[PDB]
Amino acid sequence: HMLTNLVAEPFAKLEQDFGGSIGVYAMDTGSGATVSYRAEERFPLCSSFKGFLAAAVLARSQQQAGLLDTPIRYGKNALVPWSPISEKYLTTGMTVAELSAAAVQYSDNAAANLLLKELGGPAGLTAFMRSIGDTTFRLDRWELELNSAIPGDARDTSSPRAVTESLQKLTLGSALAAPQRQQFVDWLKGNTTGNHRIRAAVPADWAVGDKTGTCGVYGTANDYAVVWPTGRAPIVLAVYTRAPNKDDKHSEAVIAAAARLALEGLGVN
Numbered sequence: 001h002m003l004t005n006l007v008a009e010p011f012a013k014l015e016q017d018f019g020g021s022i023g024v025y026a027m028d029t030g031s032g033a034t035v036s037y038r039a040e041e042r043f044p045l046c047s048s049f050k051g052f053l054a055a056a057v058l059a060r061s062q063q064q065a066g067l068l069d070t071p072i073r074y075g076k077n078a079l080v081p082w083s084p085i086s087e088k089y090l091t092t093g094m095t096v097a098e099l100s101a102a103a104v105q106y107s108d109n110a111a112a113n114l115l116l117k118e119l120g121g122p123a124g125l126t127a128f129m130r131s132i133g134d135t136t137f138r139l140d141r142w143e144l145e146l147n148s149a150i151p152g153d154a155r156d157t158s159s160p161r162a163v164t165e166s167l168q169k170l171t172l173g174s175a176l177a178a179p180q181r182q183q184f185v186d187w188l189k190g191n192t193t194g195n196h197r198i199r200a201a202v203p204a205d206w207a208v209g210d211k212t213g214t215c216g217v218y219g220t221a222n223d224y225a226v227v228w229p230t231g232r233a234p235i236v237l238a239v240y241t242r243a244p245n246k247d248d249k250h251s252e253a254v255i256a257a258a259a260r261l262a263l264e265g266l267g268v269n
């Protein structure tokens with residue numbers, strides 16, 4: 001149930017056309033069958049950390065009654081670039097739950113930084129990931145500095161394999177209480193930024209929740225998802241890219257193509 005070889009040559013050709021590195025890990029939750037390609041290499045998380053951030057908030061909500069309903073007020077100086085929800089509520093504030101939804105479904109930067117502050121910063125989110133058994137994940141910096149994607153720099157990285165393992169634990173396993181688990185799924189399902197990535201490889205009659213990341217440099221962008229094919233167990237998968245030159249462009253088409261190859265490798269029609 002390493003189907004990694006059905007699709008190892010097509011992944012290598014896709015990566016050669018792209019001109020960089022592609023990292024994939026895909027898990028069939030029914031059989032436990034996996035597809036790996038550069039699955040243990042580090043890639044920059046970019047915005048993809050915001051899904052784990054929302055899950056860490058949900059975990060804390062199990063301990064702290066009322067956390068999700070707490071109003072948060074912020075100044076103009078909190079509004080960093082790409083804050084499309086939080087800029088509309090500057091004069092009013094938003095709840096923790098609303099910031100978490102904005103962080104997940106619009107990749108809202110100001111919302112992500114405000115929730116990082118609630119958790120004790122990048123070290124607090126790293127702490128939550130260690131708490132679910134993820135020893136690979138590290139967040140080191142805040143938005144926007146975490147997007148530097150410097151070749152060889154382990155800061156603000158994880159592996160495709162650790163991202164998939166943690167995503168399965170949070171969405172399908174026992175890392176969150178059932179209500180919090182379904183809220184995390186529902187936030188991922190409502191994501192607006194991923195239509196050209198994993199979703200572009202998934203039939204319209206299958207449910208999917210995803211979180212994107214785009215660093216803006218070094219051909220670096222990513223997506224992770226849970227996919228619910230009809231008539232079989234869910235699939236969890238992560239697709240990360242980087243490239244050697246700062247002005248290399250990312251490709252959403254390459255992420256969708258990689259997701260297609262992972263699903264073909266798992267035998268999902």
Ligand SMILES: Cc1c(CP(=O)(O)O)c2ccc(Br)cc2n(CC2CCCC2)c1=O
Nearest residue numbers: 046047082107144147193212213214215216
């Ligand atoms: C938050 C954010 C996103 C959405 P996501 O990261 O989830 O895919 C985004 C998406 C595409 C591009 Br092209 C630039 C982006 N930027 C700007 C880049 C990262 C920092 C400056 C350049 C976003 O901030």
